[PDB]
Tab-separated table of C-alpha atoms and ligand atoms in Angstrom:
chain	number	residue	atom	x	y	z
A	1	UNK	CA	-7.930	4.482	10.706
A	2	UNK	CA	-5.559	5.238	7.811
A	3	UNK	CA	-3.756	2.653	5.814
A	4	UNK	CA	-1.176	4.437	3.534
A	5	UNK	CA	0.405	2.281	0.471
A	6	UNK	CA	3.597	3.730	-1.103
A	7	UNK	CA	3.458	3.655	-5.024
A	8	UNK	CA	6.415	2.933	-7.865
A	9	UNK	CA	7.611	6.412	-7.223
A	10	UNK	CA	8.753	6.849	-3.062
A	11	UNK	CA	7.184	10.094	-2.770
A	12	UNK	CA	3.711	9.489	-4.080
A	13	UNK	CA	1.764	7.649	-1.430
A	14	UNK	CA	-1.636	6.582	-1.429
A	15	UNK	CA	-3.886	6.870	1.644
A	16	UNK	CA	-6.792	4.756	2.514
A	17	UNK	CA	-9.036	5.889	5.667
A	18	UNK	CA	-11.487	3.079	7.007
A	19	UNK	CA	-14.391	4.980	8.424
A	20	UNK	CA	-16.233	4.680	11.541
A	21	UNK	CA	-19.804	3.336	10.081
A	22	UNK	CA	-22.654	3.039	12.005
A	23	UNK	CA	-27.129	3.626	11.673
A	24	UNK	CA	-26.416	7.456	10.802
A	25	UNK	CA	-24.230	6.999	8.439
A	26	UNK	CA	-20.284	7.328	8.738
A	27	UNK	CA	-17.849	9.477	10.002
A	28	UNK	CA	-13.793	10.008	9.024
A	29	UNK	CA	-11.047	12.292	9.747
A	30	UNK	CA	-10.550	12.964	5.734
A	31	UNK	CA	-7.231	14.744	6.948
A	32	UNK	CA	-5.353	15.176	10.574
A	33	UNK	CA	-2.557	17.891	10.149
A	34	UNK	CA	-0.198	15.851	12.965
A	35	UNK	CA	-0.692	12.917	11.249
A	36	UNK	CA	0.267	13.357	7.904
A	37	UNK	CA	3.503	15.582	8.718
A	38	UNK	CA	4.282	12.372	11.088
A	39	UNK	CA	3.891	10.309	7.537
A	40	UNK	CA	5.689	12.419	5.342
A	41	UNK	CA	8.353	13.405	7.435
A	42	UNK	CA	8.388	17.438	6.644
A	43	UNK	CA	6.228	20.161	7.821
A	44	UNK	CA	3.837	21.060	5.470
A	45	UNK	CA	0.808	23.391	5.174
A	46	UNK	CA	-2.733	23.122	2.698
A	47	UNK	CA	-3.213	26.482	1.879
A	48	UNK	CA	-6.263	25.941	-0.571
A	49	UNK	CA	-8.666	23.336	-0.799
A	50	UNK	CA	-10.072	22.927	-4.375
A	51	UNK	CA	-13.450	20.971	-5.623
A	52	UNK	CA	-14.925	20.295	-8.956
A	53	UNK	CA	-17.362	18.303	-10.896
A	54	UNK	CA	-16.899	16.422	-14.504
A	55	UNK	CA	-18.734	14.737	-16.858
A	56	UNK	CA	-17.690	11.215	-17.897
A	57	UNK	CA	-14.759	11.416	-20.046
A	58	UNK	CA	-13.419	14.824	-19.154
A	59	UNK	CA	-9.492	14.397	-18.615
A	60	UNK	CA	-8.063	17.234	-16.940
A	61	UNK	CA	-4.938	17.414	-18.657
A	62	UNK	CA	-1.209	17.556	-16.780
A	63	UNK	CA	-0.771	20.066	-14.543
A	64	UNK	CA	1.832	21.618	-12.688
A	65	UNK	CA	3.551	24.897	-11.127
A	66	UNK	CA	7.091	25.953	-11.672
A	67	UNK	CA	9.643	27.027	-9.142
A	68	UNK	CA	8.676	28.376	-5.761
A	69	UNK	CA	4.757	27.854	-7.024
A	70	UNK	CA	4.887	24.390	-7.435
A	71	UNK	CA	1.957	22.856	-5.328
A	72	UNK	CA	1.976	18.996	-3.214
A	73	UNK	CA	-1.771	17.839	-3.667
A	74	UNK	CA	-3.493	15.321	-1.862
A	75	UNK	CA	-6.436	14.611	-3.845
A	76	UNK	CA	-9.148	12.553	-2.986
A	77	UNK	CA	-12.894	11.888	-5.229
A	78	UNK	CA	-15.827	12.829	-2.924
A	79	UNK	CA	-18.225	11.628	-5.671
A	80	UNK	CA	-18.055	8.854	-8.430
A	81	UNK	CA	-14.475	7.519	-9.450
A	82	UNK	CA	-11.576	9.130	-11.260
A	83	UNK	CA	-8.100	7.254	-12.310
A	84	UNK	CA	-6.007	9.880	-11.238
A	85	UNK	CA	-2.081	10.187	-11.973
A	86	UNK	CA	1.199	11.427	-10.389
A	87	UNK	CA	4.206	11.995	-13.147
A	88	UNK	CA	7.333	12.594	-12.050
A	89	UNK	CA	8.834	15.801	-13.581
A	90	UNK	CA	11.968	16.538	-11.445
A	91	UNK	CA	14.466	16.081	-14.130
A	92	UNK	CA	17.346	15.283	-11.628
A	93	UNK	CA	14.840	12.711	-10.179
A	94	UNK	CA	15.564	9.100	-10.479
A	95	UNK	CA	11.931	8.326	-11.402
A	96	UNK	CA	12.087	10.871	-13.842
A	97	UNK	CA	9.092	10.944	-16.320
A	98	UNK	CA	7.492	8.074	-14.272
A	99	UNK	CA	3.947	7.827	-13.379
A	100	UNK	CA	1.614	6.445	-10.651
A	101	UNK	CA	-2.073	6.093	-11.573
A	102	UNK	CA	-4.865	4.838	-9.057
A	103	UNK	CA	-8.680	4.954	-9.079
A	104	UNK	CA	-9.923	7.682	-6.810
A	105	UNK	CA	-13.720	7.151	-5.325
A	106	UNK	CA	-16.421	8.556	-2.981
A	107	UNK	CA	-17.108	4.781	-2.545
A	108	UNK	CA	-13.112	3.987	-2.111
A	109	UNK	CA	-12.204	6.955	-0.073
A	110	UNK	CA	-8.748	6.540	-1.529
A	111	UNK	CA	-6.540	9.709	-1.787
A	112	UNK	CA	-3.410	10.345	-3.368
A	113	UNK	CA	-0.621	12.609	-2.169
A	114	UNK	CA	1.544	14.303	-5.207
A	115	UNK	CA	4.377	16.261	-3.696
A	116	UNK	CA	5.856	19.507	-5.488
A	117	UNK	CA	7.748	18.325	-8.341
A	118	UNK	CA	4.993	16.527	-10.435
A	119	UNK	CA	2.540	17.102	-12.649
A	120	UNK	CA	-1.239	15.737	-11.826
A	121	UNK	CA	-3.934	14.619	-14.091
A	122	UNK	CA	-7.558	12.265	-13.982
A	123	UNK	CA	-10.031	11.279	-16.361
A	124	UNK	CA	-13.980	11.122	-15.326
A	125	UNK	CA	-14.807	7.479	-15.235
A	126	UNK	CA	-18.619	7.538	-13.967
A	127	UNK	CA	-21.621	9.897	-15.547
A	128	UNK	CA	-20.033	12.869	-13.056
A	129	UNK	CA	-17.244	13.118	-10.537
A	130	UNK	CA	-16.757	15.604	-7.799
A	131	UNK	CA	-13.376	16.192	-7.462
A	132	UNK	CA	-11.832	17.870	-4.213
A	133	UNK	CA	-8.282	18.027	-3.309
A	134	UNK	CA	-6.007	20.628	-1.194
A	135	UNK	CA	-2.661	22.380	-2.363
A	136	UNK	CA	0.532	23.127	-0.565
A	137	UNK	CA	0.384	26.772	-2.576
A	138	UNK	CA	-1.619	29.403	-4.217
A	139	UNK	CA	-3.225	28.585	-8.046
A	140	UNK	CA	-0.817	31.287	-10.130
A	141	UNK	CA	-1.774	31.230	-13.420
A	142	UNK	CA	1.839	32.933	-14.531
A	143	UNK	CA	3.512	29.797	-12.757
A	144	UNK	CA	0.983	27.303	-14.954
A	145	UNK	CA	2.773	24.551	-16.917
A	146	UNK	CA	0.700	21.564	-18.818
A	147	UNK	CA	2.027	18.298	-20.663
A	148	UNK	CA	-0.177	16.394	-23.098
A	149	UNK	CA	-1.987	13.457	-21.485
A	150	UNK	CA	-0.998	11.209	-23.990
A	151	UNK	CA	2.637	12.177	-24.627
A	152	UNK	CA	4.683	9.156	-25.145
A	153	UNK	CA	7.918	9.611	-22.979
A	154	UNK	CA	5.867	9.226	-19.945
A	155	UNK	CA	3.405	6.519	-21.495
A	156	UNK	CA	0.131	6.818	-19.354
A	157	UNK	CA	-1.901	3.697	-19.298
A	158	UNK	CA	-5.494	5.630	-19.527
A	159	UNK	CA	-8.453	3.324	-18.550
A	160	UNK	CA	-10.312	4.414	-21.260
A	161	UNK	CA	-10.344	3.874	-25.177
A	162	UNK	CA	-12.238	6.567	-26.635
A	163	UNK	CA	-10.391	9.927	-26.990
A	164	UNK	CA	-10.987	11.872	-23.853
A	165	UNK	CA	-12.862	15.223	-23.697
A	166	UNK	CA	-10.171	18.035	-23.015
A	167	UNK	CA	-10.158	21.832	-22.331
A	168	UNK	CA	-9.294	24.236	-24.998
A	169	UNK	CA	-5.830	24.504	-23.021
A	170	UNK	CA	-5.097	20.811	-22.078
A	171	UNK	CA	-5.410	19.648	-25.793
A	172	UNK	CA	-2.783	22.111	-26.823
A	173	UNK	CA	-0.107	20.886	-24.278
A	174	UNK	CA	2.964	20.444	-25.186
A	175	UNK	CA	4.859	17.172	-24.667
A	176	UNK	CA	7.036	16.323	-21.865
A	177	UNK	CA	10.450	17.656	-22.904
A	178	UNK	CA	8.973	20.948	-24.150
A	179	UNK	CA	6.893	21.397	-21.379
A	180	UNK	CA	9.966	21.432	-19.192
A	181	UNK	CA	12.268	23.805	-21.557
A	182	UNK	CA	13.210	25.555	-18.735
A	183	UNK	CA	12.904	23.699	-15.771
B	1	UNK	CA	-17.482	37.471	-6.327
B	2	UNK	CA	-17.122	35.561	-3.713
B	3	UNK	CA	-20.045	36.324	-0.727
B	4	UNK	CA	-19.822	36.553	2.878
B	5	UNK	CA	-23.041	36.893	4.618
B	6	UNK	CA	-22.972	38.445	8.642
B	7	UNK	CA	-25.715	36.602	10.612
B	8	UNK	CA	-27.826	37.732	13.777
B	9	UNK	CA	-24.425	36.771	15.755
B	10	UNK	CA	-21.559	38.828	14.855
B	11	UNK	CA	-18.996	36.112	14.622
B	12	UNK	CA	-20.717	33.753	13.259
B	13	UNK	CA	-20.376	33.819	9.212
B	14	UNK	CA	-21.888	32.353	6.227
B	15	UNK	CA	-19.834	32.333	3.005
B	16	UNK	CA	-20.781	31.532	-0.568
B	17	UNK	CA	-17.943	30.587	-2.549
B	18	UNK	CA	-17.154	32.051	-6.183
B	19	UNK	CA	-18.370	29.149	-8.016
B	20	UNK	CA	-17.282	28.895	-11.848
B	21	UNK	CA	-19.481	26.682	-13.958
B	22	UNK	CA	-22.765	24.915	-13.887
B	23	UNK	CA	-23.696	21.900	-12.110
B	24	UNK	CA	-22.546	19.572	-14.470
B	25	UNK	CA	-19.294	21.298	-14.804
B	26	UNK	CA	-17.829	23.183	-12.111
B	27	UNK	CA	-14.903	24.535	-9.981
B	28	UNK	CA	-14.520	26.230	-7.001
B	29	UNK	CA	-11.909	26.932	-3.988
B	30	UNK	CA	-13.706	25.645	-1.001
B	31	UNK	CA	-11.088	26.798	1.106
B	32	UNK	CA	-8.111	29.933	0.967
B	33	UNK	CA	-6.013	30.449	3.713
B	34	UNK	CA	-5.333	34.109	2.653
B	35	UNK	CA	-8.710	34.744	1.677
B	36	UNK	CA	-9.948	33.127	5.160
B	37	UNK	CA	-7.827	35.440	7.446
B	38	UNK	CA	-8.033	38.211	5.855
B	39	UNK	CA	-11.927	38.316	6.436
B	40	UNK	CA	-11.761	36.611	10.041
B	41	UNK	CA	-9.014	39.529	10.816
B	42	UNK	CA	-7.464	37.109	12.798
B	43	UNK	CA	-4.546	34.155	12.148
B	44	UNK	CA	-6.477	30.927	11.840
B	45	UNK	CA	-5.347	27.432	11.058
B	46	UNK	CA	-6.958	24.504	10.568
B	47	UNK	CA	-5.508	21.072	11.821
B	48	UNK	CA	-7.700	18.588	10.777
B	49	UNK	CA	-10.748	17.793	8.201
B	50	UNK	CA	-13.910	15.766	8.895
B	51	UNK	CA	-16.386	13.748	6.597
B	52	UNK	CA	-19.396	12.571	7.418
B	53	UNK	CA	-22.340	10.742	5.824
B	54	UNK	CA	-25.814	10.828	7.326
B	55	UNK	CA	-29.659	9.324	6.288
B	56	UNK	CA	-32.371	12.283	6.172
B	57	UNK	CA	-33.435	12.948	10.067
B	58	UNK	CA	-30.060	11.948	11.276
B	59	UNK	CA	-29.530	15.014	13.430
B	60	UNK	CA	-25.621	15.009	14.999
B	61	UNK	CA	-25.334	17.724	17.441
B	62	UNK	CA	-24.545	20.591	19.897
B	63	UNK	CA	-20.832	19.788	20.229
B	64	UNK	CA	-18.255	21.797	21.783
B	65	UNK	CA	-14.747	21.132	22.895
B	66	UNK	CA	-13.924	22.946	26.351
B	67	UNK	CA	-11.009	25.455	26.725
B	68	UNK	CA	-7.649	25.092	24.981
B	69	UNK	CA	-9.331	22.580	23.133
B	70	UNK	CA	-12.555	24.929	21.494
B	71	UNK	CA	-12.749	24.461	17.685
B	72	UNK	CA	-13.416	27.047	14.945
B	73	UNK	CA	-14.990	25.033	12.197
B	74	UNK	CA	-15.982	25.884	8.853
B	75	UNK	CA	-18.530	23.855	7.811
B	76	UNK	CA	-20.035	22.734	4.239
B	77	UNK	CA	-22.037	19.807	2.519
B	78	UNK	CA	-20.914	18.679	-0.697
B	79	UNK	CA	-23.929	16.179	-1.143
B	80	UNK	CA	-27.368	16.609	-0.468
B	81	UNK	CA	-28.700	19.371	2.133
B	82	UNK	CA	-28.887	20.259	5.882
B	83	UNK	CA	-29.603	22.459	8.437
B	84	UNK	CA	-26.557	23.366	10.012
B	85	UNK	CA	-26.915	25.415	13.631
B	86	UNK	CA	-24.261	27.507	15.522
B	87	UNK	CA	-25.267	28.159	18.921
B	88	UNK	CA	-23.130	31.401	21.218
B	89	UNK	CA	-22.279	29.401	24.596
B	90	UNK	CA	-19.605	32.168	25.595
B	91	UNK	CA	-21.331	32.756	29.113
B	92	UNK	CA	-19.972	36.770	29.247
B	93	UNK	CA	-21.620	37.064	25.512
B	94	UNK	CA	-24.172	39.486	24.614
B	95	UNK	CA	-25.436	36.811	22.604
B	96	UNK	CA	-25.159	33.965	24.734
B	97	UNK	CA	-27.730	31.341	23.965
B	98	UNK	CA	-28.654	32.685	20.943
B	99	UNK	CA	-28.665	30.735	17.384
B	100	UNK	CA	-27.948	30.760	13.838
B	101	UNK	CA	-29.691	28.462	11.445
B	102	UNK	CA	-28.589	27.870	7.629
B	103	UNK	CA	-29.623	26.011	4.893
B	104	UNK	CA	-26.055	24.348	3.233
B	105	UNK	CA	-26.556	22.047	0.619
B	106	UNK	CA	-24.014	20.596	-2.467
B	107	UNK	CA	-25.730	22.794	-4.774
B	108	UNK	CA	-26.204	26.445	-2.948
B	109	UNK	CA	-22.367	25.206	-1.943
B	110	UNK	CA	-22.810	27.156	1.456
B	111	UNK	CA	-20.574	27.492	4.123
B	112	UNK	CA	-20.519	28.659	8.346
B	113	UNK	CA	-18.043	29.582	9.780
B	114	UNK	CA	-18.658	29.280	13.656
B	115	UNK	CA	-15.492	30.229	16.069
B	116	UNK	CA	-14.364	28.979	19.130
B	117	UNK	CA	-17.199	29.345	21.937
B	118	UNK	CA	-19.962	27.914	19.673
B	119	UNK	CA	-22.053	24.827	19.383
B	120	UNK	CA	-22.316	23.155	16.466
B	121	UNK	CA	-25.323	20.623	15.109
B	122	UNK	CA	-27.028	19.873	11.608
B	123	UNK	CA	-30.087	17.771	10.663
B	124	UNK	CA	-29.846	16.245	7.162
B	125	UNK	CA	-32.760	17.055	4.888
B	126	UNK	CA	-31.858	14.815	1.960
B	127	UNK	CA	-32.227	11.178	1.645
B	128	UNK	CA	-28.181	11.339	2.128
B	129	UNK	CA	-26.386	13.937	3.436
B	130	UNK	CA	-21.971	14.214	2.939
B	131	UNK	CA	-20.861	17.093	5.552
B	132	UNK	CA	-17.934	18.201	5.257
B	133	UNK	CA	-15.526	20.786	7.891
B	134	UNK	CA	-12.813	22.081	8.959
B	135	UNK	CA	-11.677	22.446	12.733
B	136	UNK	CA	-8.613	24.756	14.054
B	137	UNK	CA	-8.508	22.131	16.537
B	138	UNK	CA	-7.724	18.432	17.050
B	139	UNK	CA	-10.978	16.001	18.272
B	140	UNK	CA	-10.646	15.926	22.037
B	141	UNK	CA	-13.555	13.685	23.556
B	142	UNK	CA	-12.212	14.278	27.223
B	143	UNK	CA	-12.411	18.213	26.062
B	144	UNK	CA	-16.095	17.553	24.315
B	145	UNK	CA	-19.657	18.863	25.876
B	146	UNK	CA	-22.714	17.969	24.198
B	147	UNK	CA	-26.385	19.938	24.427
B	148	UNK	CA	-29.540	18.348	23.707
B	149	UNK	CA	-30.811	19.483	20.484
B	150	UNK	CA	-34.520	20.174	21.467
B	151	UNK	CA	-32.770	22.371	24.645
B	152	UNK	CA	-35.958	25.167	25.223
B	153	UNK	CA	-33.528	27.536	26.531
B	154	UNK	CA	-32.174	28.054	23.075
B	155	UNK	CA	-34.791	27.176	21.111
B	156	UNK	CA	-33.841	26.175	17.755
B	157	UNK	CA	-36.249	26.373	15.184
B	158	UNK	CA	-35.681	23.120	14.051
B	159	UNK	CA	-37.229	22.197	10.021
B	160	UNK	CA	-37.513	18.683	9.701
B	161	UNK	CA	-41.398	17.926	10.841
B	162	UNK	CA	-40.628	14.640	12.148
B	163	UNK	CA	-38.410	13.458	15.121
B	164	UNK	CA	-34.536	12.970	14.292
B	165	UNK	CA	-32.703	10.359	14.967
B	166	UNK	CA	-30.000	10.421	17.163
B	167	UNK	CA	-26.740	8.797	18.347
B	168	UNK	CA	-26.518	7.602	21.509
B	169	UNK	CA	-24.307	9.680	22.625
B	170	UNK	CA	-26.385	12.581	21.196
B	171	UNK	CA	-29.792	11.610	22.362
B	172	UNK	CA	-27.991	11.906	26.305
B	173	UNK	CA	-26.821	14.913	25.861
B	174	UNK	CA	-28.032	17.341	28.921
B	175	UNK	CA	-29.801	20.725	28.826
B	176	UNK	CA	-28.015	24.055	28.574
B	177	UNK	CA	-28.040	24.376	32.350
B	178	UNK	CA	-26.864	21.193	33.070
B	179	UNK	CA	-23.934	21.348	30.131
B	180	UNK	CA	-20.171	21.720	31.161
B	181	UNK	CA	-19.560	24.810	29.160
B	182	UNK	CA	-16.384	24.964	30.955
B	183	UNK	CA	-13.030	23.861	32.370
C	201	TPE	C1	-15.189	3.989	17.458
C	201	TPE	C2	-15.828	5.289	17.084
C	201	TPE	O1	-17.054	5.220	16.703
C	201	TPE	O2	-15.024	6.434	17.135
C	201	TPE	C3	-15.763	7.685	17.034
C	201	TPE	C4	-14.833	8.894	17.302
C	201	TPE	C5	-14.289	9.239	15.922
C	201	TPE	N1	-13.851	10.632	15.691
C	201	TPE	C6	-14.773	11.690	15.856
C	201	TPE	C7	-14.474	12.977	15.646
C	201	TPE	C8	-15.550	13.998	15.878
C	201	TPE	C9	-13.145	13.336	15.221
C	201	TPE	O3	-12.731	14.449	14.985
C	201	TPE	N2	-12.282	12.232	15.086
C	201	TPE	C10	-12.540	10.894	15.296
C	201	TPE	O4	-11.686	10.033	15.129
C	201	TPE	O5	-15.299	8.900	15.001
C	201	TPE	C11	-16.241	7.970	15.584
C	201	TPE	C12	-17.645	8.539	15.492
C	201	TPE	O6	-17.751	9.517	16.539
C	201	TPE	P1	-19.085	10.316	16.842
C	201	TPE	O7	-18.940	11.263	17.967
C	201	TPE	O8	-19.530	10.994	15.608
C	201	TPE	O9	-20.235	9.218	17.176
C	201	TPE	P2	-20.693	8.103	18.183
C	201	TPE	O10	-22.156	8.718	18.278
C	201	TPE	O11	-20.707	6.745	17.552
C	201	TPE	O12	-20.128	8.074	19.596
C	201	TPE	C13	-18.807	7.501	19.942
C	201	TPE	C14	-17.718	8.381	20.227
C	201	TPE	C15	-16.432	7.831	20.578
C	201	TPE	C16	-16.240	6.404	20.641
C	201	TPE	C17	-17.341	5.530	20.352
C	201	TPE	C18	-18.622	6.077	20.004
C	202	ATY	C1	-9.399	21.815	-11.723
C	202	ATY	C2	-8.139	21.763	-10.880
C	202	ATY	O1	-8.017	20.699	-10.210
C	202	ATY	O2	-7.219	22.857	-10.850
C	202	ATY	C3	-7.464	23.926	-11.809
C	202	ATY	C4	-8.347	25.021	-11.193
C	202	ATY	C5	-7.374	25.854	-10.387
C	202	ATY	N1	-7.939	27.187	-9.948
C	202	ATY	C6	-8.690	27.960	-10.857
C	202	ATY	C7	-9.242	29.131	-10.568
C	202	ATY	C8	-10.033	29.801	-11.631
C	202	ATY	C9	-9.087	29.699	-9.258
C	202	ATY	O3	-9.542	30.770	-8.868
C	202	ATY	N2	-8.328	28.883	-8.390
C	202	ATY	C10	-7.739	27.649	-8.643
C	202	ATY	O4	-7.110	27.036	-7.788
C	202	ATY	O5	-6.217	25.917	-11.221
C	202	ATY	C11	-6.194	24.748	-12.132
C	202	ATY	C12	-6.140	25.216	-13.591
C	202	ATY	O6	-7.448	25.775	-13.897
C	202	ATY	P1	-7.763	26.771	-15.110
C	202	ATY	O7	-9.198	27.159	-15.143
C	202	ATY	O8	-6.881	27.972	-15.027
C	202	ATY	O9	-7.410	25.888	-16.468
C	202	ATY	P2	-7.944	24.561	-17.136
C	202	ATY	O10	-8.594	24.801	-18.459
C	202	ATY	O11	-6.871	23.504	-17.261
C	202	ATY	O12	-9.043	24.131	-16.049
């Protein structure tokens, strides 16, 4: 079964499956189509699944697509742990510039679901984390928008202390407000 | 580019997904929609996503849901290795009976694609195996049919030199001329 907890933010919701364990092993519906329209209330369709692997420390900056690109994730860590986070960027939203964070883990089988509208971002807590999550729309790299992980306006409470290990392109993000220019 | 393999059964595919990285560092989609049906030729959608976890030996297999409720499932393991099989139970197929074997394992990131009309088993090779798939239909155990994995009228070459272990459920499973392949 499927427990889902709602976050700060009404949209973001995180899921937590209970599998069916046994000698083999276990065994989990990590998604049901049916069911999670039924839970959010709208139609909506995963058109790419998405899986990765990071070193301890590597932050994957804030990402996000603009307009008719933007992409609803429901992310989930199929090995180690992330702390993975939701911001709010819908500047008419009420939880504007708000953020969710939760730890994401092979061993919690948590998942998060980030609808279109925010921007997503995790940090590598153990040695390596594999990474897998699936988008409601196509990776558009003329649609790409980033915000720095650290920007103050939104205020991210990182797990960590040390400064985290960032791509060329997530270190030169620009900060909340600039980032949305013209959104 | 990304690499899609045509085995001894025509509809039965294995794909190698463009992987970007090394193993300490990676991304890849595991999944596109567009990608997917363009290269099946036909509309495909998947409903609901399975993960599993199984100790080496743990065999799970020949499954098949009957009818309206046949599943298309694209199949991967994103840690440790198995043998995954794909067996043609169409009765009016030139290939009926016949079977596909493939190595998938986290780090050759291999996936089958085996259509409606097939049955599906795996044996896990690793200490631990995480299989992962997709189905274009929803579990229906009143719809399922099981076939006993050592069935001599297929023959699968199995790999693992010592006996799996089985469910249950799976160790009951009848022979290919005893299964309900239909209705
Ligand atoms: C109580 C329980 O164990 O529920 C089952 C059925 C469930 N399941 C299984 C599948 C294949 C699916 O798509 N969705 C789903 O919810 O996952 C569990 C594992 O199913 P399984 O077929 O892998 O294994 P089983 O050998 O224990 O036989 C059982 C099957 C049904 C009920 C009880 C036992
Ligand atoms: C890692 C993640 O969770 O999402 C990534 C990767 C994703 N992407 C990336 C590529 C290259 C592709 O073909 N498809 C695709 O969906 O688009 C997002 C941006 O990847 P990026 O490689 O363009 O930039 P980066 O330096 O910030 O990684």
């Amino acid at each position: 079964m499927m427990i889902v907890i709602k976050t700060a933010i009404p949209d973001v919701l995180i899921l937590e499956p209970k599998v069916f364990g046994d000698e083999r092993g276990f065994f989990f519906e990590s998604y049901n189509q049916q069911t999670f329209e039924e839970l959010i209330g709208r139609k909506v369709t995963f058109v790419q699944d998405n899986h990765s692997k990071s070193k301890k420390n590597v932050l994957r900056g804030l990402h996000f697509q603009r307009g008719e690109n933007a992409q609803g994730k429901l992310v989930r860590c199929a090995v180690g742990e992330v702390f993975d986070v939701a911001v709010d960027i819908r500047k008419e939203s009420p939880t504007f510039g708000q953020w969710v964070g939760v730890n994401l883990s092979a061993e919690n089988k948590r998942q998060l679901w980030i609808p279109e509208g925010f921007a997503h971002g995790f940090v590598t807590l153990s040695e390596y984390a594999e990474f897998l999550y699936k988008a409601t729309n196509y990776y558009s790299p003329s649609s790409e928008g980033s915000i720095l992980w650290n920007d103050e306006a939104i205020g991210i409470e990182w797990p960590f202390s040390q400064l985290p290990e960032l791509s060329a392109k997530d270190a030169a993000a620009p900060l909340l407000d600039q980032a949305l220019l013209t959104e």
